[PDB]
C-alpha cells in the first residue's frame, strides 16, 4: 500500500 | 450521528478545498492600501497525508479574477479587478 | 467569469466554514499517540469583518463525534470515537 496515494480497506487489514 | 471512519479519511485526505486567504499574502507589494473585503475565497490544497514526513502540495495551478475595493490613505475608494492563484489538483510529496 | 464585488464580499464575510484541523492542535495532551487520519473536517469561524478592529468569533458551539484510528508505538491500531468542537454561529466583535 503505497504511502503517497489515497484508501483501500484491505491497507487498513495491515493495521 | 457519529461520522464513520472511511468518511472521515476521505474528507480529510489531501485535496483542493475553499480556503479564506488574506489578500496581503498574495499581494505583499501593495501593503500600503486597505482592501475590502480583506480576505478572499480560493481553492487551495490542504488536508493530511498518510505520513507525517509528507506535505500536501499542488501540481496543477490556475487563476481567477475578482472585483476588490482598494483604498490608499489620503486618496479615493476604487473598485477594480485582481487576479489570484487557485489549486486544481494536489499530491503528497516528501517534506 | 469575473466574480462580482457583492458576491466576493458575501462569500468571504465572517461565517462557519469547513476547515481542516490538525488533531495534535486540538489535543496537545495526547502527543504520545499517532492519529489516522491526522486531521479532521470541522465547521469553524473564518472570514473577515468590515473593520480591522473586529474579529470573527463563535456565538454557538456544539460537539461532533468521529471514528479515528489511534496508534501507540509498539502497540495496536484501535479505531475509537473522539469528540471535537464545532462552531454553529459566528459574529464580528471587538478585540
XYZ file of N, CA, C and O in Angstrom:
820
model
N 0.850 -1.209 0.000
C 0.000 0.000 0.000
C 0.879 1.251 0.000
O 1.445 1.641 1.034
N 0.980 1.863 -1.179
C 1.894 2.961 -1.425
C 1.482 4.172 -0.574
O 0.338 4.646 -0.650
N 2.463 4.682 0.181
C 2.296 5.656 1.223
C 1.884 7.020 0.633
O 1.345 7.860 1.359
N 2.117 7.218 -0.674
C 1.984 8.507 -1.377
C 0.580 8.695 -1.974
O 0.311 9.756 -2.531
N -0.300 7.684 -1.890
C -1.623 7.730 -2.576
C -2.741 7.406 -1.592
O -2.509 6.969 -0.470
N -3.973 7.627 -2.047
C -5.138 7.538 -1.186
C -5.512 6.077 -0.995
O -5.667 5.351 -1.964
N -5.654 5.647 0.265
C -7.527 4.258 0.602
C -8.277 2.956 0.726
O -9.355 2.976 1.363
N -7.754 1.850 0.151
C -8.408 0.520 0.213
C -8.547 0.035 1.675
O -7.611 0.142 2.467
N -9.733 -0.492 2.029
C -9.978 -1.160 3.335
C -8.914 -2.235 3.611
O -8.193 -2.195 4.614
N -8.828 -3.190 2.708
C -7.862 -4.275 2.843
C -5.499 -3.203 3.165
O -4.951 -3.786 4.105
N -5.270 -1.899 2.874
C -4.347 -1.029 3.637
C -4.691 -0.945 5.136
O -3.796 -0.942 5.973
N -5.972 -0.803 5.479
C -6.328 -0.512 6.858
C -6.469 -1.822 7.648
O -6.171 -1.845 8.832
N -6.918 -2.897 7.002
C -6.047 -5.291 7.254
C -4.817 -5.236 8.116
O -4.773 -5.634 9.270
N -3.785 -4.718 7.508
C -2.399 -4.401 7.759
C -2.214 -3.515 8.998
O -1.085 -3.423 9.439
N -3.272 -2.867 9.567
C -3.093 -2.018 10.754
C -4.556 -3.670 11.983
O -4.083 -4.288 12.907
N -25.377 9.544 15.432
C -24.929 10.504 14.401
C -23.407 10.708 14.484
O -22.934 11.838 14.426
N -22.664 9.604 14.604
C -21.196 9.561 14.592
C -20.698 9.443 13.147
O -21.253 8.678 12.357
N -19.613 10.157 12.828
C -19.083 10.147 11.489
C -18.150 8.944 11.331
O -17.159 8.832 12.056
N -18.446 8.112 10.328
C -17.793 6.816 10.129
C -16.400 7.034 9.536
O -16.174 8.017 8.819
N -15.497 6.083 9.835
C -14.050 6.214 9.656
C -13.691 6.551 8.211
O -12.975 7.513 7.966
N -14.145 5.727 7.260
C -13.732 5.897 5.868
C -14.268 7.223 5.319
O -13.699 7.806 4.405
N -15.367 7.703 5.892
C -15.903 9.002 5.531
C -14.933 10.093 6.023
O -14.646 11.037 5.294
N -14.408 9.938 7.250
C -13.508 10.921 7.860
C -12.214 11.005 7.052
O -11.770 12.088 6.671
N -11.642 9.833 6.784
C -10.428 9.703 5.998
C -10.586 10.358 4.612
O -9.717 11.116 4.179
N -11.682 10.057 3.908
C -11.918 10.582 2.538
C -12.095 12.110 2.554
O -11.584 12.818 1.694
N -12.782 12.635 3.568
C -12.987 14.073 3.623
C -11.717 14.797 4.103
O -11.618 15.996 3.894
N -10.749 14.116 4.738
C -9.584 14.863 5.205
C -8.349 14.648 4.324
O -7.389 15.377 4.505
N -8.378 13.725 3.351
C -7.156 13.415 2.574
C -6.915 14.531 1.546
O -7.830 14.876 0.785
N -5.682 15.071 1.569
C -5.052 15.989 0.606
C -5.867 16.186 -0.676
O -5.857 15.326 -1.551
N -6.512 17.360 -0.791
C -7.301 17.763 -1.963
C -7.538 19.279 -1.943
O -7.317 19.967 -0.952
N -7.966 19.879 -3.065
C -8.334 21.292 -3.067
C -9.557 21.598 -2.195
O -10.600 20.980 -2.405
N -9.440 22.554 -1.265
C -10.600 22.998 -0.510
C -10.701 24.534 -0.503
O -9.692 25.214 -0.453
N -11.938 25.055 -0.459
C -12.215 26.507 -0.252
C -11.605 26.975 1.081
O -11.956 26.517 2.137
N -10.685 27.917 0.952
C -9.822 28.470 1.974
C -9.888 30.006 1.870
O -9.754 30.590 0.755
N -10.126 30.668 2.999
C -10.190 32.125 3.025
C -8.769 32.628 3.255
O -8.110 32.168 4.164
N -8.309 33.513 2.367
C -6.934 33.908 2.305
C -6.855 35.429 2.327
O -7.515 36.081 1.547
N -6.008 35.969 3.204
C -5.808 37.406 3.272
C -5.145 37.870 1.973
O -4.169 37.299 1.528
N -5.666 38.958 1.411
C -5.183 39.471 0.163
C -3.705 39.888 0.267
O -2.967 39.778 -0.713
N -3.258 40.380 1.425
C -1.859 40.844 1.568
C -0.857 39.711 1.343
O 0.229 39.954 0.841
N -1.222 38.497 1.750
C -0.450 37.300 1.453
C -0.158 37.195 -0.051
O 0.927 36.784 -0.459
N -1.140 37.509 -0.894
C -0.955 37.315 -2.341
C -0.373 38.592 -2.958
O 0.363 38.529 -3.944
N -0.667 39.748 -2.359
C -0.120 40.978 -2.882
C 0.646 41.703 -1.787
O 0.209 42.735 -1.295
N 1.816 41.186 -1.359
C 2.577 41.838 -0.292
C 3.174 43.203 -0.707
O 3.424 44.041 0.142
N 3.368 43.418 -2.013
C 3.889 44.670 -2.596
C 2.922 45.844 -2.364
O 3.350 46.993 -2.284
N 1.620 45.548 -2.251
C 0.577 46.570 -2.113
C 0.159 46.716 -0.637
O -0.980 46.992 -0.324
N 1.126 46.636 0.276
C 0.834 46.628 1.705
C 0.334 47.999 2.206
O -0.191 48.078 3.296
N 0.511 49.077 1.431
C 0.111 50.455 1.844
C -1.424 50.617 1.799
O -1.968 51.404 2.547
N -2.116 49.871 0.925
C -3.561 50.013 0.720
C -4.339 49.290 1.831
O -3.758 48.533 2.593
N -5.657 49.541 1.904
C -6.618 48.686 2.612
C -7.571 48.074 1.577
O -8.024 48.770 0.682
N -7.921 46.795 1.741
C -8.808 46.116 0.806
C -10.117 45.735 1.481
O -10.130 45.331 2.633
N -11.191 45.821 0.702
C -12.488 45.346 1.098
C -13.015 44.378 0.047
O -13.034 44.703 -1.135
N -13.424 43.185 0.476
C -13.021 42.588 1.729
C -11.507 42.363 1.793
O -10.831 42.379 0.769
N -11.008 42.103 3.000
C -9.576 41.877 3.242
C -9.160 40.419 2.937
O -7.969 40.099 2.773
N -10.148 39.527 2.931
C -9.970 38.082 2.750
C -10.687 37.690 1.446
O -11.726 38.244 1.102
N -10.171 36.697 0.735
C -10.837 36.230 -0.469
C -10.930 34.689 -0.444
O -10.096 34.014 0.166
N -11.971 34.052 -1.035
C -12.100 32.589 -1.034
C -11.556 31.896 -2.295
O -12.023 32.199 -3.402
N -10.650 30.934 -2.085
C -9.761 30.349 -3.083
C -9.623 28.846 -2.834
O -9.414 28.382 -1.701
N -9.657 28.083 -3.917
C -9.390 26.688 -3.841
C -7.893 26.531 -3.618
O -7.096 27.021 -4.425
N -7.541 25.915 -2.493
C -6.164 25.633 -2.146
C -6.052 24.235 -1.496
O -6.965 23.778 -0.768
N -4.928 23.565 -1.803
C -4.539 22.274 -1.261
C -4.474 22.359 0.258
O -3.869 23.257 0.783
N -5.120 21.404 0.930
C -4.984 21.176 2.365
C -5.380 19.755 2.712
O -5.603 18.932 1.847
N -5.528 19.481 4.000
C -5.752 18.145 4.450
C -4.444 17.468 4.773
O -3.407 18.122 4.811
N -4.507 16.161 5.019
C -3.372 15.437 5.538
C -2.981 14.327 4.561
O -3.690 13.998 3.605
N -1.804 13.773 4.830
C -1.236 12.660 4.101
C -1.176 11.444 5.034
O -1.425 11.546 6.245
N -0.827 10.293 4.463
C -0.745 9.057 5.201
C 0.401 9.108 6.235
O 0.367 8.384 7.225
N 1.385 9.998 6.041
C 2.614 10.042 6.856
C 2.901 11.485 7.293
O 2.493 12.431 6.621
N 3.638 11.635 8.402
C 3.995 12.954 8.962
C 5.359 13.421 8.424
O 5.945 14.342 8.981
N 5.853 12.785 7.352
C 7.020 13.243 6.595
C 6.655 13.602 5.165
O 7.524 13.693 4.305
N 5.355 13.800 4.914
C 4.847 14.213 3.612
C 4.019 15.490 3.778
O 3.408 15.690 4.823
N 4.023 16.334 2.736
C 3.241 17.561 2.684
C 2.286 17.476 1.492
O 2.582 16.830 0.491
N 1.144 18.153 1.636
C 0.107 18.291 0.608
C 0.376 19.576 -0.194
O 0.191 20.682 0.339
N 0.792 19.406 -1.461
C 1.259 20.488 -2.340
C 0.611 20.327 -3.706
O 0.240 19.222 -4.087
N 0.435 21.429 -4.468
C -0.301 21.394 -5.731
C 0.574 21.008 -6.925
O 1.793 21.148 -6.859
N -0.093 20.543 -7.983
C 0.523 20.047 -9.182
C -0.074 20.758 -10.395
O 0.565 20.862 -11.404
N -1.336 21.166 -10.295
C -1.987 21.969 -11.305
C -2.503 23.262 -10.651
O -3.293 23.222 -9.704
N -2.047 24.400 -11.180
C -2.434 25.735 -10.742
C -3.355 26.353 -11.807
O -3.536 25.772 -12.859
N -3.963 27.506 -11.494
C -4.865 28.294 -12.398
C -5.245 29.625 -11.719
O -5.008 29.813 -10.541
N -5.836 30.555 -12.472
C -6.029 31.923 -11.996
C -7.522 32.237 -12.017
O -8.250 31.719 -12.836
N -7.968 33.037 -11.045
C -9.316 33.568 -11.031
C -9.252 35.075 -10.748
O -8.321 35.567 -10.081
N -10.221 35.809 -11.294
C -10.223 37.257 -11.234
C -11.466 37.732 -10.494
O -12.566 37.247 -10.764
N -11.273 38.691 -9.581
C -12.321 39.171 -8.693
C -12.274 40.693 -8.588
O -11.192 41.298 -8.726
N -13.442 41.283 -8.280
C -13.601 42.722 -8.039
C -13.401 43.024 -6.550
O -14.206 42.605 -5.756
N -12.356 43.803 -6.232
C -11.942 44.159 -4.885
C -11.901 45.687 -4.732
O -11.377 46.386 -5.568
N -12.383 46.193 -3.604
C -12.268 47.603 -3.274
C -10.876 47.850 -2.685
O -10.423 47.084 -1.863
N -10.227 48.921 -3.134
C -8.850 49.313 -2.810
C -8.868 50.778 -2.352
O -9.363 51.634 -3.061
N -8.370 51.036 -1.140
C -8.291 52.368 -0.531
C -6.827 52.686 -0.209
O -6.221 51.969 0.571
N -6.285 53.764 -0.797
C -4.971 54.333 -0.418
C -5.218 55.475 0.562
O -6.177 56.220 0.386
N -4.420 55.631 1.646
C -4.630 56.729 2.596
C -4.414 58.087 1.907
O -3.455 58.244 1.139
N -5.322 59.037 2.171
C -5.345 60.350 1.509
C -5.498 60.168 -0.013
O -4.752 60.763 -0.799
N -6.479 59.339 -0.401
C -6.843 59.039 -1.800
C -8.223 58.352 -1.812
O -8.831 58.132 -0.761
N -8.710 57.998 -3.005
C -10.089 57.537 -3.197
C -10.278 56.035 -2.989
O -9.331 55.254 -2.912
N -11.550 55.653 -2.888
C -12.028 54.279 -2.909
C -12.318 53.843 -4.355
O -13.260 54.334 -4.977
N -11.501 52.923 -4.879
C -11.648 52.390 -6.213
C -12.049 50.919 -6.148
O -11.490 50.195 -5.362
N -12.966 50.484 -7.021
C -13.244 49.057 -7.219
C -12.597 48.596 -8.531
O -12.741 49.234 -9.564
N -11.911 47.454 -8.486
C -11.016 47.029 -9.569
C -10.765 45.531 -9.545
O -11.075 44.847 -8.551
N -10.202 45.033 -10.652
C -10.041 43.616 -10.921
C -8.685 43.171 -10.385
O -7.696 43.824 -10.675
N -8.672 42.073 -9.615
C -7.432 41.472 -9.131
C -7.440 39.950 -9.362
O -8.463 39.242 -9.280
N -6.251 39.440 -9.646
C -6.089 38.073 -10.057
C -5.487 37.266 -8.906
O -4.594 37.722 -8.256
N -5.981 36.049 -8.685
C -5.446 35.188 -7.624
C -5.237 33.777 -8.164
O -5.933 33.367 -9.083
N -4.288 33.065 -7.559
C -3.895 31.703 -7.906
C -4.757 30.690 -7.135
O -4.888 30.773 -5.909
N -5.339 29.737 -7.875
C -6.119 28.588 -7.358
C -5.413 27.253 -7.661
O -4.741 27.116 -8.673
N -5.624 26.244 -6.802
C -5.030 24.915 -6.952
C -6.100 23.945 -7.447
O -7.174 23.927 -6.890
N -5.799 23.147 -8.488
C -6.824 22.297 -9.197
C -6.654 20.796 -8.890
O -7.649 20.051 -8.930
N -5.405 20.359 -8.652
C -5.071 19.022 -8.195
C -3.898 19.155 -7.211
O -3.121 20.094 -7.308
N -3.797 18.206 -6.271
C -2.791 18.186 -5.187
C -2.128 16.804 -5.176
O -2.648 15.881 -5.783
N -0.980 16.672 -4.510
C -0.290 15.367 -4.367
C 0.488 15.406 -3.055
O 0.868 16.479 -2.613
N 0.703 14.241 -2.444
C 1.527 14.160 -1.262
C 2.975 13.848 -1.678
O 3.224 12.846 -2.351
N 3.907 14.739 -1.302
C 5.331 14.674 -1.690
C 6.188 14.808 -0.431
O 5.685 15.247 0.604
N 7.482 14.389 -0.458
C 8.334 14.412 0.740
C 8.715 15.816 1.249
O 9.057 16.688 0.451
N 8.670 15.984 2.579
C 8.942 17.244 3.305
C 10.331 17.177 3.958
O 11.258 17.906 3.581
N -15.483 33.513 -15.569
C -16.164 34.795 -15.334
C -15.474 35.534 -14.185
O -14.990 34.909 -13.244
N -15.434 36.863 -14.290
C -15.010 37.739 -13.212
C -16.072 37.692 -12.106
O -17.254 37.840 -12.392
N -15.646 37.487 -10.854
C -16.572 37.384 -9.719
C -16.926 38.790 -9.241
O -16.041 39.588 -8.952
N -18.231 39.058 -9.126
C -18.740 40.425 -8.911
C -18.524 40.821 -7.438
O -18.589 39.969 -6.531
N -18.264 42.117 -7.205
C -17.909 42.626 -5.885
C -18.809 42.032 -4.787
O -18.321 41.387 -3.875
N -20.122 42.267 -4.880
C -21.079 41.858 -3.862
C -20.964 40.352 -3.573
O -21.177 39.928 -2.436
N -20.633 39.550 -4.587
C -20.533 38.112 -4.431
C -19.245 37.767 -3.661
O -19.253 36.932 -2.767
N -18.128 38.419 -3.991
C -16.882 38.207 -3.264
C -17.125 38.478 -1.774
O -16.686 37.698 -0.900
N -17.812 39.590 -1.487
C -17.999 40.052 -0.135
C -18.884 39.085 0.647
O -18.604 38.809 1.765
N -19.961 38.603 0.036
C -20.920 37.735 0.704
C -20.228 36.419 1.049
O -20.473 35.842 2.082
N -19.379 35.942 0.143
C -18.782 34.643 0.317
C -17.680 34.688 1.387
O -17.401 33.671 1.977
N -17.078 35.858 1.638
C -15.890 35.921 2.472
C -16.161 36.559 3.841
O -15.245 36.589 4.675
N -17.390 37.045 4.076
C -17.773 37.655 5.371
C -17.916 36.552 6.432
O -18.512 35.503 6.164
N -17.361 36.824 7.622
C -17.489 36.034 8.888
C -18.651 35.043 8.816
O -19.797 35.442 8.763
N -18.326 33.749 8.791
C -19.323 32.682 8.858
C -18.613 31.350 9.114
O -17.387 31.247 9.021
N -19.364 30.288 9.475
C -18.765 28.981 9.706
C -18.388 28.352 8.366
O -19.221 28.319 7.473
N -17.150 27.854 8.280
C -16.566 27.284 7.060
C -15.959 25.917 7.422
O -15.405 25.738 8.516
N -16.084 24.948 6.510
C -15.443 23.658 6.681
C -13.921 23.857 6.573
O -13.424 24.411 5.632
N -13.209 23.372 7.585
C -11.837 23.682 7.853
C -11.150 22.392 8.287
O -11.722 21.621 9.034
N -9.929 22.188 7.796
C -9.144 21.021 8.075
C -8.193 21.387 9.208
O -7.372 22.309 9.070
N -8.393 20.678 10.326
C -7.801 20.953 11.576
C -6.977 19.742 12.013
O -7.497 18.629 12.057
N -5.719 20.005 12.382
C -4.772 19.005 12.872
C -5.222 18.495 14.252
O -5.502 19.276 15.153
N -5.287 17.168 14.401
C -5.774 16.555 15.622
C -4.815 16.855 16.779
O -5.278 16.982 17.886
N -3.504 16.976 16.511
C -2.490 17.369 17.534
C -2.840 18.722 18.176
O -2.677 18.885 19.383
N -3.297 19.687 17.365
C -3.559 21.058 17.828
C -4.823 21.098 18.685
O -5.005 22.021 19.451
N -5.689 20.097 18.558
C -6.907 20.055 19.357
C -6.677 19.292 20.666
O -7.374 19.536 21.645
N -5.741 18.338 20.651
C -5.382 17.543 21.812
C -3.861 17.540 21.931
O -3.208 16.575 21.543
N -3.230 18.628 22.422
C -1.778 18.635 22.625
C -1.355 17.659 23.736
O -0.222 17.179 23.713
N -2.292 17.357 24.651
C -2.109 16.437 25.790
C -1.845 14.996 25.318
O -1.154 14.241 25.993
N -2.410 14.607 24.172
C -2.294 13.240 23.665
C -1.197 13.196 22.593
O -1.391 12.586 21.540
N -0.043 13.820 22.882
C 1.066 13.972 21.914
C 1.848 12.655 21.731
O 2.656 12.556 20.794
N 1.616 11.656 22.601
C 2.310 10.345 22.563
C 1.783 9.445 21.425
O 2.550 8.651 20.877
N 0.493 9.570 21.068
C -0.188 8.715 20.058
C 0.066 9.235 18.625
O 0.562 10.348 18.416
N -0.253 8.396 17.627
C -0.338 8.792 16.202
C -1.807 8.667 15.781
O -2.493 7.733 16.187
N -2.282 9.597 14.950
C -3.683 9.569 14.513
C -3.770 9.352 13.004
O -2.983 9.897 12.239
N -4.776 8.577 12.604
C -5.068 8.343 11.216
C -6.582 8.410 11.007
O -7.330 7.698 11.665
N -7.061 9.330 10.162
C -6.313 10.433 9.578
C -5.819 11.356 10.688
O -6.324 11.249 11.823
N -4.864 12.237 10.357
C -4.216 13.088 11.382
C -4.879 14.476 11.477
O -4.594 15.239 12.404
N -5.782 14.793 10.545
C -6.602 15.980 10.661
C -8.073 15.631 10.370
O -8.367 14.543 9.879
N -8.998 16.533 10.738
C -10.422 16.282 10.553
C -11.133 17.511 9.999
O -10.736 18.632 10.243
N -12.275 17.338 9.311
C -13.058 18.460 8.819
C -14.059 18.963 9.854
O -14.859 18.194 10.328
N -13.985 20.252 10.181
C -14.808 20.843 11.201
C -15.349 22.190 10.711
O -14.670 22.933 10.015
N -16.601 22.471 11.074
C -17.170 23.777 10.949
C -16.525 24.674 12.011
O -16.550 24.379 13.187
N -15.848 25.721 11.538
C -15.210 26.755 12.368
C -15.388 28.133 11.712
O -15.484 28.241 10.495
N -15.388 29.165 12.558
C -15.462 30.545 12.177
C -14.227 30.904 11.367
O -13.131 30.688 11.818
N -14.461 31.441 10.172
C -13.469 32.112 9.360
C -14.103 33.244 8.563
O -15.316 33.485 8.621
N -13.277 33.945 7.793
C -13.740 35.075 7.035
C -13.266 36.344 7.688
O -12.520 36.271 8.660
N -13.695 37.476 7.135
C -13.239 38.792 7.570
C -14.436 39.668 7.966
O -15.600 39.339 7.708
N -14.132 40.785 8.620
C -15.129 41.711 9.091
C -14.947 43.040 8.350
O -13.927 43.275 7.652
N -15.936 43.914 8.515
C -15.949 45.184 7.833
C -14.719 46.024 8.232
O -14.250 46.841 7.448
N -14.183 45.782 9.434
C -13.177 46.619 10.058
C -11.999 45.739 10.493
O -12.116 44.511 10.566
N -10.864 46.389 10.773
C -9.631 45.740 11.215
C -9.438 45.887 12.736
O -8.341 45.695 13.241
N -10.504 46.231 13.465
C -10.529 46.172 14.933
C -11.601 45.213 15.457
O -11.994 45.286 16.626
N -12.084 44.324 14.573
C -13.085 43.305 14.872
C -12.507 41.937 14.507
O -11.738 41.828 13.566
N -12.899 40.907 15.263
C -12.529 39.522 14.980
C -13.820 38.722 14.765
O -14.860 39.040 15.326
N -13.748 37.727 13.885
C -14.815 36.790 13.686
C -14.782 35.811 14.872
O -13.732 35.261 15.164
N -15.885 35.673 15.619
C -15.870 34.778 16.799
C -17.172 33.992 16.895
O -18.229 34.405 16.421
N -17.085 32.805 17.517
C -18.241 31.926 17.669
C -19.215 32.418 18.753
O -18.773 32.975 19.748
N -20.517 32.234 18.492
C -21.601 32.555 19.391
C -22.437 31.312 19.742
O -23.301 31.372 20.598
N -22.224 30.200 19.048
C -22.985 28.971 19.254
C -22.052 27.821 18.883
O -21.548 27.805 17.786
N -21.789 26.917 19.828
C -20.901 25.764 19.627
C -21.655 24.473 19.935
O -22.712 24.499 20.562
N -21.084 23.360 19.475
C -21.617 22.012 19.671
C -20.463 21.040 19.465
O -19.355 21.469 19.202
N -20.748 19.745 19.598
C -19.760 18.699 19.513
C -20.177 17.727 18.408
O -21.369 17.496 18.181
N -19.173 17.225 17.685
C -19.366 16.149 16.754
C -18.374 15.028 17.099
O -17.244 15.288 17.581
N -18.824 13.782 16.886
C -18.074 12.584 17.255
C -17.610 11.909 15.965
O -18.411 11.748 15.062
N -16.330 11.524 15.895
C -15.802 10.864 14.705
C -15.009 9.605 15.071
O -14.408 9.509 16.125
N -14.999 8.636 14.156
C -14.190 7.452 14.329
C -12.777 7.759 13.863
O -12.579 8.079 12.686
N -11.819 7.652 14.796
C -10.405 7.906 14.500
C -9.584 6.657 14.812
O -9.882 5.947 15.733
N -8.520 6.436 14.041
C -7.592 5.381 14.330
C -6.424 5.940 15.152
O -5.701 6.862 14.716
N -6.258 5.328 16.332
C -5.271 5.672 17.343
C -4.217 4.555 17.370
O -4.540 3.391 17.631
N -2.971 4.926 17.051
C -1.820 4.033 17.049
C -0.833 4.504 18.124
O -0.400 5.655 18.095
N -0.506 3.622 19.078
C 0.603 3.827 20.035
C 1.827 3.067 19.522
O 1.687 1.931 19.075
N 3.053 3.647 19.539
C 4.238 2.928 19.070
C 4.472 1.675 19.930
O 4.370 1.743 21.162
N 4.756 0.546 19.269
C 4.871 -0.769 19.914
C 3.553 -1.112 20.632
O 3.543 -1.468 21.809
N 2.439 -0.985 19.900
C 1.088 -1.352 20.359
C 0.162 -1.400 19.134
O 0.612 -1.181 18.004
N -1.131 -1.676 19.355
C -2.075 -1.969 18.257
C -2.695 -0.727 17.626
O -2.570 0.384 18.154
N -3.343 -0.936 16.470
C -4.235 0.033 15.823
C -5.677 -0.201 16.309
O -6.282 -1.240 16.034
N -6.203 0.764 17.067
C -7.574 0.764 17.578
C -8.325 1.915 16.900
O -7.822 3.036 16.867
N -9.508 1.636 16.344
C -10.418 2.680 15.893
C -11.456 2.955 16.989
O -12.281 2.087 17.291
N -11.436 4.189 17.520
C -12.361 4.660 18.537
C -12.895 6.050 18.238
O -12.361 6.787 17.427
N -13.968 6.400 18.941
C -14.630 7.668 18.796
C -13.829 8.759 19.515
O -13.337 8.542 20.612
N -13.739 9.934 18.883
C -13.245 11.133 19.519
C -14.204 12.282 19.232
O -14.957 12.255 18.256
N -14.131 13.298 20.090
C -15.029 14.428 20.057
C -14.255 15.713 19.743
O -13.155 15.902 20.213
N -14.872 16.585 18.949
C -14.280 17.832 18.550
C -15.344 18.911 18.584
O -16.543 18.630 18.432
N -14.865 20.140 18.739
C -15.703 21.272 18.866
C -15.982 21.876 17.489
O -15.069 22.051 16.680
N -17.249 22.233 17.265
C -17.705 22.895 16.057
C -18.358 24.233 16.402
O -18.920 24.399 17.474
N -18.291 25.179 15.459
C -18.973 26.466 15.588
C -20.204 26.458 14.694
O -20.095 26.173 13.526
N -21.346 26.821 15.267
C -22.620 26.834 14.573
C -23.012 28.267 14.156
O -23.658 28.409 13.156
N -22.675 29.301 14.939
C -22.951 30.693 14.565
C -21.705 31.523 14.862
O -20.969 31.225 15.820
N -21.481 32.537 14.017
C -20.309 33.433 14.084
C -20.771 34.890 14.032
O -21.755 35.212 13.380
N -20.030 35.766 14.706
C -20.325 37.195 14.719
C -19.012 37.981 14.826
O -18.029 37.501 15.413
N -19.019 39.192 14.258
C -17.887 40.125 14.303
C -17.981 40.968 15.582
O -19.001 41.597 15.810
N -16.918 40.955 16.400
C -16.871 41.587 17.747
C -15.521 42.272 17.960
O -14.548 41.921 17.298
N -15.412 43.242 18.904
C -14.138 43.909 19.210
C -13.041 42.996 19.775
O -13.353 41.963 20.339
N -11.774 43.408 19.629
C -10.611 42.619 20.090
C -10.161 43.122 21.470
O -10.012 42.344 22.415
